[PDB]
Amino acid sequence: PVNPEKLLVITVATAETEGYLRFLRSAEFFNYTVRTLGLGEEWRGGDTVGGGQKVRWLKKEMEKYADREDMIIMFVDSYDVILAGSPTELLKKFVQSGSRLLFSAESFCWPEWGLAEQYPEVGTGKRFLNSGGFIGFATTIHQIVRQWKYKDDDDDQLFYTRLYLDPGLREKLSLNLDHKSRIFQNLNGALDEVVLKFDRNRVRIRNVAYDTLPIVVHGNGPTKLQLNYLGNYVPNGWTPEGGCGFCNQDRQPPPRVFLAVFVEQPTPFLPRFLQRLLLLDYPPDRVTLFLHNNEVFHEPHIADSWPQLQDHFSAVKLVGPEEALSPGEARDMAMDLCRQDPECEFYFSLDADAVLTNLQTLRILIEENRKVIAPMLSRHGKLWSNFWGALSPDEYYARSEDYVELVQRKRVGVWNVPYISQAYVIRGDTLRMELPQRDVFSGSDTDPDMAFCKSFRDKGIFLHLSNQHEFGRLLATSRYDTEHLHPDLWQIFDNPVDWKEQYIHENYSRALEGEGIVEQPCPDVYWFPLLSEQMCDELVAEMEHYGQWSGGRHEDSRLAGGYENVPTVDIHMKQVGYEDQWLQLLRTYVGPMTESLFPGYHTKARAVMNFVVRYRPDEQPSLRPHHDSSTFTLNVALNHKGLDYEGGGCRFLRYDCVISSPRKGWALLHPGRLTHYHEGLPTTWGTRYIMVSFVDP
């Protein structure tokens, strides 16, 4: 057994990039000893073929070990390598190979492809050398690297390849290749061969082609993204029993922050979004607000909330549609405002379609101490989120092996992902020292959101995505219909969660769960809060905006004294185009309320007659006794008694019972036939509005 203390891992790194730090963490996890060559100096090794500087530094380092037969040295890259197994296991596998210097093997011959015939034949394994990782005795390695006498821009790979292809040297020093990836696993050309092998508190990779458990995972060539993926788990990235291994899990001045808000398309519930900005649990005197609105549709919305935002934050800036900025130039300008302000410690980009339910998001993200991190936001009950887990070869969306697991929060942690959007927090120093260019989001025909992620990947920055907590959701903005007086009224299908929070009474849900909010003012007439004040005001407004009320000749489905049809001044939902929306409200909220209050009854909230009635002393103030063409009737007040009108009660003749004082939010549920002959009392002043549905006719 070779003493693990005789093993030394040597690697090259000119800076402490996240990839290098990721490498060290994996090495520290297995208690490896690591010598890092070239931390101070800068990389003259080029971009293409190169890395000759690697050999020069190694040749110098080796001279102090030139006679150490007792020393085993392993050389590996650091930016694109993670370790997966112990020094003890690594040394056992090395001795098993009977080699004195074992290079990693790969599927391709590079750079000179024609040398492929000088290589020995290998039945089913990888055939060619890869200088990304080799291991051998110090004496043997010294005899190899000693022969370096070339430029820093020359090909380190070709240097080793030429030595290995020397048949006499190959067998005199007994050099070998790890054909079946027992120790070194190069990913390029082998993606379909590699899968994660999980354990309780550590994760490995398994090669299913050769049924081996490699030690060194090298994401060489165009496999940086796959290595990022594997590196979220291997070795202690994320474990079934330990969870994430580098994030917070369990949560005196906070840093100054530049908050940038982007309205790049017509967005539902923007007033609610702007209102929510005042509620983020981050001291606003430490926040600077930049808001780009591109939509003339939203100029009134922004204008209404701007005085509150200016009072709230320490500094504010609006760039409206009159400036003719594209999304790419707007996001460039916002990010560059933080870059050029040394007091900007963090940059927080937030799009209008991002709904943050966790007011602590900025804190949580800032405390995770990453260069770039984004909270995971999902469309309600669907898989689409604000991140991608994988990329198609030509940089389109692809589903990663673990995407659904992350979106469904079956695995939670902070993940290295190739694409993030809609919300993210960027270290200010990173903008200053690593991405100093202005053209982050633009300068190409590429989409701005993709150009942003590409810009950071090209610099080797990690794009982190936290689903460690519930952060929020994403609004559906696809086909938002803007041609209404109040478009958010028509949003009950696309954004039902947000639609409920805005338009359903706040105490509806607790009234549905009992708690004694529902009342029964008259026998079998139930009274419950249904619509919020905003819904009523907006619904009345949309009716008056149509403005074509009924009158003479109007026929309603009421029954009074045989055939003397009883009319109302009203507008039917069908006329204003809101029928399908109202039926959906009936299905979702009135049905279950009815089935709770009338145990035994079942309904699917069928309604042919849905309409808003107007009562005025000047036209039709009252509604004479009658029955309804309905199994039950929904009677929703839409404005305040006293403030808006006087009188106008609802009277149930057979019970000598009167709803004298209706409530603006509240609905009456009463039977429509046989027992509940009712009349609407006269409206003596003002205007009275109610919403009526003859359901289950």
Ligand X SMILES: O=C(O)CCC(=O)C(=O)O
Ligand Y SMILES: *[C@@H]1O[C@H](CO)[C@@H](O[C@@H]2O[C@H](CO)[C@@H](O)[C@H](O)[C@H]2NC(C)=O)[C@H](O)[C@H]1NC(C)=O
Candidate ranges 103-111, 118-126, 209-217, 555-563; the one touching a copy of itself (CB under 8 A):
555-563
**Of 93, 454, 627, 641, the one binding a copy of itself by CB under 8 A:** 627
Instruction: Choose among a copy of itself, ligand NAG, ligand X, none what residue 635 binds, the Cβ cut-off being 5 to 8 Å by kind.
Output: ligand X
What is the Cα–Cα distance from 537 to 531, expressed in whole angstroms?
A: 10
Which tokens belong to 311? Answer: 């009072």
391, β-bridge pairs: 397
628 annotated as belonging to a binding site for a ligand:
yes
Residue ranges that bind ligand UGA, judged by CB under 6 A: 12-14, 43, 45, 49-51, 77-80, 132, 220-221
Task: Provide the minimum distance between the beta carbon of 143 and ligand UGA in the complex, in angstroms, as a whole number.
Answer: 23
Per CB under 6 A, does 3 bind ligand NAG? no
Asked whether residue 218 is marked as a ligand-binding residue, the answer is yes
602 binds a copy of itself (CB under 8 A): yes
* Rounded (5°) CA angle 84-89-94: 105
Residue 45 partner contact from a copy of itself, ligand UGA, Fe ion, none using kind-dependent CB cut-offs of 5 to 8 Å: ligand UGA
C-alpha angle 536/556/628, rounded to 5°?
Answer: 80
Q: How far apart are CA 113 and CA 310, in angstroms?
A: 64
Total residues contacting a copy of itself (rule CB under 8 A)?
A: 23
Identify the helix (H) or strand (E) that includes residue 167. Answer: helix 167-172
Q: Whole-angstrom Cα distance, residue 58 to residue 117?
A: 29
224 is in an annotated binding site: yes
Q: Closest separation between CB of residue 262 and a copy of itself, Å?
A: 49
Distance CA 534, CA 491 (A): 14
Say how many Å lie between the first and final Cα of the chain, rounded: 87
Q: Is 568 exposed, middle or buried (CB count within 10 Å of its CB: 0-12, 13-18, 19+)?
A: buried
628 binds ligand X (CB under 6 A): yes
Residue whose CB is nearest to ligand X in the complex, by number: 680
Is position 673 an interface residue for a copy of itself (rule: CB under 8 A)?
yes
Q: Quote the tokens at residue 587.
A: 């299905």
Contact flag: residue 635 with ligand X (CB under 6 A) = yes
Number of helices (H), then strands (E), in the chain:
20, 42
363 is in an annotated binding site: no
Q: Which of residues 489-518 bind ligand Y (CB under 6 A)?
A: 506-507
Residue 618 has, within 13 A of its CA and on its CB side, a CA count of 3
Give the Å distances, CA to CA, from 593 to 154, 513, 520.
77, 10, 13
| Cα 73 from Cα 96, distance rounded (Å) | 16
Residue with smaller CB distance to ligand NAG, 30 or 499:
30
Is residue 199 at the binding interface for ligand Y, with CB under 6 A as the rule?
Answer: no
Q: Does 599 bind a copy of itself (CB under 8 A)?
A: yes
- Say which residues have a Cβ less than 8 Å from residue 666's Cβ, sequence separation at least 6: 505, 527, 528, 529, 530, 636, 637
**Complex with Mn ion: residue 157 or 693, whichever CB lies closer:** 157
Q: How far is the CB of 697 from ligand Y (least distance, A)?
A: 31
- Does position 692 bind ligand X by CB under 6 A? yes
Q: Which of 253, 514, 547, 562 binds a copy of itself (CB under 8 A)?
A: 562
List the beta strands (DSSP E) in 503-628: 519-522, 525-529, 558-559, 570-572, 607-615, 623-628
DSSP 590: I
**Cβ(206)–Cβ(221) under 8 Å?**
no
Output 98 or 599, the one with its CB closest to a copy of itself.
599
Partner whose binding site includes residue 13, from Fe ion, ligand X, ligand UGA, none (CB under 5 to 8 Å by kind): ligand UGA
Residue number, 206 or 626, with CB nearest to a copy of itself: 626
Closest separation in Å from C-beta 227 to ligand UGA? 10
Rounded distance, CA 132 to CA 405, Å? 32
* Least gap, CB of 613 to ligand Y (angstroms): 23
- For residues 492 and 578, give the distance between their C-alpha atoms in angstroms, rounded to a whole number: 11
SS3 at position 593:
helix
Complex with a copy of itself: residue 408 or 520, whichever CB lies closer? 520
How far is residue 418's CA from residue 547's CA, in Å, rounded to a whole number? Answer: 53
C-beta of 415 vs 611, nearer to Fe ion: 611
Could you say which DSSP state residue 587 is in? Answer: I
Q: What single-letter DSSP state applies at residue 253?
A: -
Q: Is the CB of 453 or the CB of 569 nearer to Fe ion?
A: 569
Contact call for residue 156 and Mn ion (CB under 5 A): no
Token pair, residue 480, equals: 């938002």
Does the annotation list 222 as a binding residue?
A: yes
677 is in an annotated binding site: no
Give the tokens for residue 242.
């330990």
Are 126 and 154 in contact by the 8 Å Cβ rule? The answer is no
With binding defined as CB under 6 A, does residue 31 bind ligand NAG?
yes
| Alpha carbons 432 and 459: distance in angstroms, whole number | 13
Query: Cβ closer to Fe ion: 271 or 649?
Result: 649
DSSP 449-461: HHHHHHHHHHTT-
Contacts (CB under 5 A) with Mn ion, residues 128-147: 132
Residue 626 is assigned to a ligand binding site? yes
Is 221 annotated as contributing to ligand binding?
Answer: yes
Q: Closer to ligand NAG by CB, 30 or 258: give it.
A: 30
Residue ranges of the annotated binding site are: 12-14, 77-80, 218, 221-224, 558, 615, 626, 628, 635, 678, 688
Q: What does the binding site for ligand Y look like in residue numbers (CB under 6 A)?
A: 506-507, 665
Q: What does the binding site for ligand X look like in residue numbers (CB under 6 A)?
A: 558, 613, 623, 628, 635, 650, 678, 680, 690, 692
Residue ranges of the annotated binding site for UDP are: 12-14, 77-79, 221-224
Q: What does the binding site for Mn ion look like in residue numbers (CB under 5 A)?
A: 77, 80, 132, 220
Q: What does the binding site for a copy of itself look like in residue numbers (CB under 8 A)?
A: 523-524, 559-562, 598-602, 625-627, 631-632, 653-654, 671, 673-675, 677
Q: What does the binding site for ligand NAG look like in residue numbers (CB under 6 A)?
A: 30-31
Residue ranges of the annotated binding site for 2-oxoglutarate are: 558, 615, 635, 688
